[PDB]
Amino acid sequence: HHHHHSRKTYTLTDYLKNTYRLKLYSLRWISDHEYLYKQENNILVFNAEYGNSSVFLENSTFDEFGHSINDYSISPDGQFILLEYNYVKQWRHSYTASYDIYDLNKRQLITEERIPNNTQWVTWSPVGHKLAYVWNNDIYVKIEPNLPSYRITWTGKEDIIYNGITDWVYEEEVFSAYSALWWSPNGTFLAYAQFNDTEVPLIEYSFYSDESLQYPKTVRVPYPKAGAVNPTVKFFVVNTDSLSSVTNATSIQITAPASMLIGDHYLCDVTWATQERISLQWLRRIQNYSVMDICDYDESSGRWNCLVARQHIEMSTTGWVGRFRPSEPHFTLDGNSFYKIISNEEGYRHICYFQIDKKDCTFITKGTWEVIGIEALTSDYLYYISNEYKGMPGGRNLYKIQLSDYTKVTCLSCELNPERCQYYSVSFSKEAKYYQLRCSGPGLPLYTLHSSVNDKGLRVLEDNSALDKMLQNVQMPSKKLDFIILNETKFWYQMILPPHFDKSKKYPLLLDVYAGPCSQKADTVFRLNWATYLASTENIIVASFDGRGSGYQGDKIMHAINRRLGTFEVEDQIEAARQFSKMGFVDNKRIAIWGWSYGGYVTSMVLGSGSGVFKCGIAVAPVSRWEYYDSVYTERYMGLPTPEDNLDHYRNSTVMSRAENFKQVEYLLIHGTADDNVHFQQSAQISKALVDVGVDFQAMWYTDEDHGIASSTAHQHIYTHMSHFIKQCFSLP
Amino acid sequence: RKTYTLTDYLKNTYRLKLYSLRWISDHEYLYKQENNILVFNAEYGNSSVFLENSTFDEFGHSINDYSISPDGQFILLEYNYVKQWRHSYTASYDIYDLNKRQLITEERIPNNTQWVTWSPVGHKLAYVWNNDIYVKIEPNLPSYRITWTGKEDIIYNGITDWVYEEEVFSAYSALWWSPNGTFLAYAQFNDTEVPLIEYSFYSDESLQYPKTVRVPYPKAGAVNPTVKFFVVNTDSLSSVTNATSIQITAPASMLIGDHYLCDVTWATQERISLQWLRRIQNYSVMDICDYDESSGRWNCLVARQHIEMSTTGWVGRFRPSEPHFTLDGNSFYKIISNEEGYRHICYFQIDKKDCTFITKGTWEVIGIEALTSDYLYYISNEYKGMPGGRNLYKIQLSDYTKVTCLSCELNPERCQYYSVSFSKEAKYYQLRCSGPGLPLYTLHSSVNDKGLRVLEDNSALDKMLQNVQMPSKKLDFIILNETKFWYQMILPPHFDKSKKYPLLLDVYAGPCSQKADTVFRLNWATYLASTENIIVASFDGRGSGYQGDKIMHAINRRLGTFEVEDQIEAARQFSKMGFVDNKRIAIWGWSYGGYVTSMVLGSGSGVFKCGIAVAPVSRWEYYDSVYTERYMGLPTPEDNLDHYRNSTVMSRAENFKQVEYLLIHGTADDNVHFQQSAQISKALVDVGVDFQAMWYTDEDHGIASSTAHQHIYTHMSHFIKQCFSLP
Numbered sequence A: 001h002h003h004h005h006s007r008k009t010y011t012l013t014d015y016l017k018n019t020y021r022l023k024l025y026s027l028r029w030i031s032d033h034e035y036l037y038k039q040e041n042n043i044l045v046f047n048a049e050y051g052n053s054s055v056f057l058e059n060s061t062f063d064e065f066g067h068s069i070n071d072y073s074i075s076p077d078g079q080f081i082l083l084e085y086n087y088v089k090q091w092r093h094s095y096t097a098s099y100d101i102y103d104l105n106k107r108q109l110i111t112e113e114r115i116p117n118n119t120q121w122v123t124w125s126p127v128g129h130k131l132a133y134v135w136n137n138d139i140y141v142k143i144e145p146n147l148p149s150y151r152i153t154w155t156g157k158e159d160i161i162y163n164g165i166t167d168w169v170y171e172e173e174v175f176s177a178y179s180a181l182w183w184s185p186n187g188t189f190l191a192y193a194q195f196n197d198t199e200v201p202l203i204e205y206s207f208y209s210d211e212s213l214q215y216p217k218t219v220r221v222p223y224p225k226a227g228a229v230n231p232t233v234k235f236f237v238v239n240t241d242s243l244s245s246v247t248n249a250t251s252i253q254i255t256a257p258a259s260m261l262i263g264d265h266y267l268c269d270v271t272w273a274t275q276e277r278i279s280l281q282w283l284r285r286i287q288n289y290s291v292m293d294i295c296d297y298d299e300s301s302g303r304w305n306c307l308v309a310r311q312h313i314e315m316s317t318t319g320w321v322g323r324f325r326p327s328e329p330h331f332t333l334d335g336n337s338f339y340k341i342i343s344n345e346e347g348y349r350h351i352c353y354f355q356i357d358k359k360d361c362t363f364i365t366k367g368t369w370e371v372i373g374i375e376a377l378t379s380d381y382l383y384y385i386s387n388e389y390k391g392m393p394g395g396r397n398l399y400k401i402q403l404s405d406y407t408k409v410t411c412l413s414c415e416l417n418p419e420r421c422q423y424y425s426v427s428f429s430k431e432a433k434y435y436q437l438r439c440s441g442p443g444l445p446l447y448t449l450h451s452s453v454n455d456k457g458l459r460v461l462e463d464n465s466a467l468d469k470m471l472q473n474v475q476m477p478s479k480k481l482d483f484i485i486l487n488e489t490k491f492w493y494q495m496i497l498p499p500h501f502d503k504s505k506k507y508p509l510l511l512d513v514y515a516g517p518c519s520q521k522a523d524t525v526f527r528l529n530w531a532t533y534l535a536s537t538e539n540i541i542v543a544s545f546d547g548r549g550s551g552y553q554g555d556k557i558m559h560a561i562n563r564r565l566g567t568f569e570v571e572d573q574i575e576a577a578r579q580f581s582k583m584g585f586v587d588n589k590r591i592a593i594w595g596w597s598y599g600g601y602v603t604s605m606v607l608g609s610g611s612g613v614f615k616c617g618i619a620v621a622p623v624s625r626w627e628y629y630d631s632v633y634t635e636r637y638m639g640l641p642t643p644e645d646n647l648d649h650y651r652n653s654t655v656m657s658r659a660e661n662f663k664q665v666e667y668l669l670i671h672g673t674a675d676d677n678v679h680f681q682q683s684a685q686i687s688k689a690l691v692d693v694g695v696d697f698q699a700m701w702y703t704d705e706d707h708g709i710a711s712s713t714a715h716q717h718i719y720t721h722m723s724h725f726i727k728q729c730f731s732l733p
Numbered sequence B: 001r002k003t004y005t006l007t008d009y010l011k012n013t014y015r016l017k018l019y020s021l022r023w024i025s026d027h028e029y030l031y032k033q034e035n036n037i038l039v040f041n042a043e044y045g046n047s048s049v050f051l052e053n054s055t056f057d058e059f060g061h062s063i064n065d066y067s068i069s070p071d072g073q074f075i076l077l078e079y080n081y082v083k084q085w086r087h088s089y090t091a092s093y094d095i096y097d098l099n100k101r102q103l104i105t106e107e108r109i110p111n112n113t114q115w116v117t118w119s120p121v122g123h124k125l126a127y128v129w130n131n132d133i134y135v136k137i138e139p140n141l142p143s144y145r146i147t148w149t150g151k152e153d154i155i156y157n158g159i160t161d162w163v164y165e166e167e168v169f170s171a172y173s174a175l176w177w178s179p180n181g182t183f184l185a186y187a188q189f190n191d192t193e194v195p196l197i198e199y200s201f202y203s204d205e206s207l208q209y210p211k212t213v214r215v216p217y218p219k220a221g222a223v224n225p226t227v228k229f230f231v232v233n234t235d236s237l238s239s240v241t242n243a244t245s246i247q248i249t250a251p252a253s254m255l256i257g258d259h260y261l262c263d264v265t266w267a268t269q270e271r272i273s274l275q276w277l278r279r280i281q282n283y284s285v286m287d288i289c290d291y292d293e294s295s296g297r298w299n300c301l302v303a304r305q306h307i308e309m310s311t312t313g314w315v316g317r318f319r320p321s322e323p324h325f326t327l328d329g330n331s332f333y334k335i336i337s338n339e340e341g342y343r344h345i346c347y348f349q350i351d352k353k354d355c356t357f358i359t360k361g362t363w364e365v366i367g368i369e370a371l372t373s374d375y376l377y378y379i380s381n382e383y384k385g386m387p388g389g390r391n392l393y394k395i396q397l398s399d400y401t402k403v404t405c406l407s408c409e410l411n412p413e414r415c416q417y418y419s420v421s422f423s424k425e426a427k428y429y430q431l432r433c434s435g436p437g438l439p440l441y442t443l444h445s446s447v448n449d450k451g452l453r454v455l456e457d458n459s460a461l462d463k464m465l466q467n468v469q470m471p472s473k474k475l476d477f478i479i480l481n482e483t484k485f486w487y488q489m490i491l492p493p494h495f496d497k498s499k500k501y502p503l504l505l506d507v508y509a510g511p512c513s514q515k516a517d518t519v520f521r522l523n524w525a526t527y528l529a530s531t532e533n534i535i536v537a538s539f540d541g542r543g544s545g546y547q548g549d550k551i552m553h554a555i556n557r558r559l560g561t562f563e564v565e566d567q568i569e570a571a572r573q574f575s576k577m578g579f580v581d582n583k584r585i586a587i588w589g590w591s592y593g594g595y596v597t598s599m600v601l602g603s604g605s606g607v608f609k610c611g612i613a614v615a616p617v618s619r620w621e622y623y624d625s626v627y628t629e630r631y632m633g634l635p636t637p638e639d640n641l642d643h644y645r646n647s648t649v650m651s652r653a654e655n656f657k658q659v660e661y662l663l664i665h666g667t668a669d670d671n672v673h674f675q676q677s678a679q680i681s682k683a684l685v686d687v688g689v690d691f692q693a694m695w696y697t698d699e700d701h702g703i704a705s706s707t708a709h710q711h712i713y714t715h716m717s718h719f720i721k722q723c724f725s726l727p
């Protein structure tokens, strides 16, 4: 006699076997009024205005073709389609793939001049159907798909010269992309970066591969660690309309400004402003000075010219510039003007309106909250996402600000579904006539289509009511999102609370940590993850806390950690644990802490801190010493590791040096052997240091797994392993 | 109450005294009175302080080892010790004139010397530096360069490459002086085409980018190193002209394919014996080469080639045995399998094919220790039919029937496991007895055979072990398929037949292994018995050694079968002994031991609750060519690929669902590569088996760093104590 009370829970197997599936609505705008979608492997074109769908491409159309199609890409005139197959992952964004090209208008694979195998990147012109692609580190161009490729570059060399693609560090840290190609708006020009890694040292690690490989492989990746020789970067614009079959193409270099060329620098942003105007942002290796150049094509010259009167300096007095890098500009149609997120005089990031010719801008938004990103710009309105609503830093809403009158701001998402939806992202149509809103929490994700013409609702695309239906008699956890005041400053935290939560009880508590610069682990987003399991099934509270260094709350918080990683942000997680147990429902004898990446670092520093607050912890792929991590990330916060910059704190902020203190706590240390990002080296050194002071601990390596330890089988194993470690630490049976 | 604790083991609370000596002549030996070195007289037991402690105070550096020239006139001081592989290292070397009492500063031996060695008589010095051989006729004089072809990782002159060091010569050096130092014989190895194993070395915290270590290492069926052998005449070296090295090419029977050099032994001043082994290691040949004055060359008459082959397995225990030549060099003695598979001393005439076996029986000769004009001295496990006992025996050469046991009766209760060290001409001998009682070192004259004196009785160690509740050892056999198989158990103190104890099967189980012996040991097993009241057992099943070929060759071409089945059957038989709690049976081992533990855990038998594998082989294609192929042939379709395929622990991953497993491996293991563990762990991950792991950054196969050795055993003890619900 159960009387239909919820006696199910969200179990480890539910998380690992993906029992409760979260439906999404993934679309691609092809025009200003139409988008593409995958119904049942079929591709439907959708009219957003009416709803009516014409089948664009039938599922069966290919794969008589004989390979598994990984992805596709329709030429922006809707006349061709790029078919991506033989997908082979590399780093976070990079990978190789075979490609073929199908002719929509005339129904046939292009059989001549095919894109070669092992193409590293491929891309259409924004208008028409010009193709640009890198192969063996060189850029090729095809004006028509079935015609021969024009070769733009000749200098590409594996692991040394990169034309049109990033190298390891630019990929992961600057452009969050493999592509270093940029077409001008009408496809006339192809901008590209060229990276030179000749002197960049190589990280080397064993790759064991299939048990068939008799001798392991040694992977060797150009990877600059803190203070090492960084790669150098050149930038070019070629004209794709004046290519020829009888003469190599002319690339026009645009050199970096005087102020950058004097030392180590980076290319950090490329952004076309018009058919003939492009903007570069350059950053010094010491990342507190950045210069935006704005370059015009000289018609008769055939060359590019960045006038020094249109240089714009962005610099930071209290830290580095940009959140992780300088914010990208959004130009007005004529390109005489642009909007850009920059920190205001009070430390809060806001939308500044710049004139191509004036130094001074005007902030069109302000307040003790921040703009997260500018999403769309029309002649009349600017669309952006901010955390202004109810002064909740971990919330997100779409707003439109009236270009002509900055006082007239309208929240587009806030009141749609206030209790279900406080975390929005948007997808605008080609010219912003329509938009999709993607609500992510605190309730179930909700996807919806909108006319910007009068900001009304067209339809609910996905309401996740299958999932809602499944969860009725599941004892799901609840989330609490709130703050505490330390030093007269709000600091936000979130608690995944076990079902039928009881403030009389004393629950064990897992502190889930990231805590890196500009991190936010305290938000209104809805998640079915490992933490959900622990709360629902194991009655553990999983909390996270955004203390000093965290993002989206202003520079006084974010920069507080500048030149000083492994200090306040570490200290604040320890205090977070105390504050929690001061709230009355936390078992002091059972407080764990865990984290991946920077989070692994913070966990490890916490456990080695000698605080006595934590019983145990798990570090996965942790950083152990900032001289081991990459330059562009690390130096951003740490400076250079040299006696005349900041070696002292590089040296003072290693988990190794705290080995002695681990005698006080139980430690699981996990790391994948093929981790190209946070090298296994880093954990290997933690282990050695612990061995040398006689502290026992738990360890697990993952053969051939990278930073995300994302293999299906490997993913299931680590979380299973961690669950055991946690369960036995907390005496859960 | 006090027991023998993990700390006691790890911090060596209870030390075992070694009376280690080195014979200087036929009636004198050196011994190191910690802060001193004495020459002792075997005759009278008196001494004279050979070398004062703080003579080399002045030196400045730490003196790792010393070495006296045969004629006593010089002493070679070794310092700057940099371990490499199991026997290999480099070091710096100074020479000290004793007749002068001053340290030689003239034409010194360079740093990073790979090997040094006095000639057997006089004071000549041959050393290897950057893989080339140098000789010094006098310590304070310019050295003559013998070889110019040496190249790092590629050409090894007078020193062995990785695989010959580990598996063939159990030594870094490949130089062999003739008896009176006239000739330097050496081998030359080519690794030009041997693939490299690569692994990361992380090094100290301050090294920003890990180093990648690369070592030429032939895994099963990979291209092997090639070898050439040379003899140079050190009495006729020129300062003007380059030294001239004569070559002894391998027999035609070996040159037809891949082969190995596996023994160099000088017979007389002008006679050298070489043993060569085919790559399929069941056919070896001995050459007997004589120097030719008139010709300047060496000659190995095909009519003096002695074949040693095997139809049932490989040849030799781990390699063909060494010959022991009568003084005139026209005859030699040698341990070979007889017609019934038991190994015994065969007496050979240089010109004649058939040897006469001089020992016989259902037991084995372990080794020939000394040969005189009238007696042959050997060690065997004959006494009381115990394969894991060792006793010294003299066999009268004029009448093979008159055999005396020199050590059997000395102390039968305390001593059943002996080794010997004879004087230069066999006039005296030192016995080491290593069990079952506390080790006991004695000095004996070989003329009347009396027992001059006790050298060390470990009476010190005896007095402390009264206070501690020590475990006992039971050594016995079970019968399978009408055949004896031996086991030992370390029984906890105050052992009660009526109680059910947890048991840990300690395994090696590799070919010619012997884990069931009368040796006394203070180890991890001692701790588990004394402190945690676990029974630690070992068992020598099929493929185990010193019990004849029938047993040893049982796993020929079939590694990962009978030796695995037999550890399980042992566990079964032990759990029918009534004092084994069979809800709590565990298995562990290192190397082969790890492989077998792993293979056993993946068997699905149901016998074992949990296990530990430390640096295990996971499949044989990952282990070196020489060891692996000796037992497994080649891993090709036309040979033994199928069984290589079937013998992997990865193929059994699914069965680990039934057991709790701990997999440990040092990341800088040159021998059994971490690869081997990485592939197991991956296999387990793919079938969803949870398990325990631990890597040891930059530890090699020993995991022998002070801290690392403590850390691993501690981790292992926690795992076992959790498995057995011991608090």
Ligand SMILES: CC(C)Cn1c(CN)c(-c2ccccc2)c2cc(OCC(N)=O)ccc2c1=O
Binding pocket: A172, A173, A174, A176, A324, A513, A514, A515, A516, A595, A596, A597, A598, A599, A600, A623, A633, A678
């Ligand atoms: C900023 C981007 C351009 C790149 N980037 C980087 C930098 N490589 C890191 C990171 C930070 C420190 C150490 C290694 C990696 C990172 C860490 C994350 O951790 C998740 C968590 N702990 O919950 C999630 C995302 C990111 C990421 O996107």
Ligand SMILES: CC(C)Cn1c(CN)c(-c2ccccc2)c2cc(OCC(N)=O)ccc2c1=O
Binding pocket: B166, B167, B168, B170, B318, B507, B508, B510, B589, B590, B591, B592, B593, B594, B617, B627, B672
């Ligand atoms: C035979 C010699 C020429 C060299 N050798 C070798 C060969 N590499 C091995 C061994 C066997 C298989 C796999 C890896 C190593 C070995 C293993 C030992 O393990 C002891 C235990 N497990 O209790 C002890 C000694 C030895 C040894 O001396």
Ligand SMILES: *[C@@H]1O[C@H](CO)[C@@H](O)[C@H](O)[C@H]1NC(C)=O
Binding pocket: A047, A050, A052, A054
């Ligand atoms: C979609 O709907 C409209 C409604 O009038 C119709 O005219 C049209 O045929 C459909 N679109 C296309 C491209 O077929």
Ligand SMILES: *[C@@H]1O[C@H](CO)[C@@H](O)[C@H](O)[C@H]1NC(C)=O
Binding pocket: A098, A114, A115, A116, A117
């Ligand atoms: C891709 O590879 C396959 C087989 O290796 C080949 O048949 C095919 O023609 C290749 N494609 C191109 C564009 O070269």
Ligand SMILES: *[C@@H]1O[C@H](CO)[C@@H](O)[C@H](O)[C@H]1NC(C)=O
Binding pocket: A155, A161, A196, A197, A198, A199
């Ligand atoms: C890359 O840089 C090196 C110097 O580090 C220089 O010699 C080389 O020419 C550069 N290569 C290219 C293609 O720019």
Ligand SMILES: *[C@@H]1O[C@H](CO)[C@@H](O)[C@H](O)[C@H]1NC(C)=O
Binding pocket: A154, A246, A247, A248
């Ligand atoms: C293009 O440049 C490469 C090398 O710079 C050269 O080999 C090739 O001949 C050039 N092509 C033309 C058309 O000049």
Ligand SMILES: *[C@@H]1O[C@H](CO)[C@@H](O)[C@H](O)[C@H]1NC(C)=O
Binding pocket: A286, A288, A289, A315, A316, A317, A639
């Ligand atoms: C950048 O930071 C450096 C080192 O912290 C400092 O000396 C300087 O103030 C900054 N440079 C600029 C241009 O603001």
Ligand SMILES: *[C@@H]1O[C@H](CO)[C@@H](O)[C@H](O)[C@H]1NC(C)=O
Binding pocket: B092, B108, B109, B110, B111
């Ligand atoms: C060997 O090294 C030491 C210290 O670096 C030095 O004193 C000596 O001169 C070196 N070389 C030789 C040829 O002895």
Ligand SMILES: *[C@@H]1O[C@H](CO)[C@@H](O)[C@H](O)[C@H]1NC(C)=O
Binding pocket: B149, B155, B190, B192, B193
């Ligand atoms: C070593 O063998 C290689 C063939 O693999 C050959 O190049 C070289 O001549 C040989 N070296 C010596 C010293 O014999």
Ligand SMILES: *[C@@H]1O[C@H](CO)[C@@H](O)[C@H](O)[C@H]1NC(C)=O
Binding pocket: B148, B240, B241, B242
């Ligand atoms: C010896 O041989 C080497 C290498 O072949 C060469 O330098 C020279 O001809 C000789 N040198 C001496 C000292 O005899």
Ligand SMILES: *[C@@H]1O[C@H](CO)[C@@H](O)[C@H](O)[C@H]1NC(C)=O
Binding pocket: B180, B182, B269, B270
């Ligand atoms: C050592 O042996 C060689 C070779 O027979 C010989 O020339 C020399 O005389 C011998 N030494 C003595 C002391 O007889």
Ligand SMILES: *[C@@H]1O[C@H](CO)[C@@H](O)[C@H](O)[C@H]1NC(C)=O
Binding pocket: B280, B282, B283, B309, B310, B311, B312, B633
């Ligand atoms: C040596 O071994 C091979 C392969 O196992 C076998 O075919 C051959 O008969 C053996 N040779 C002898 C002489 O027993």
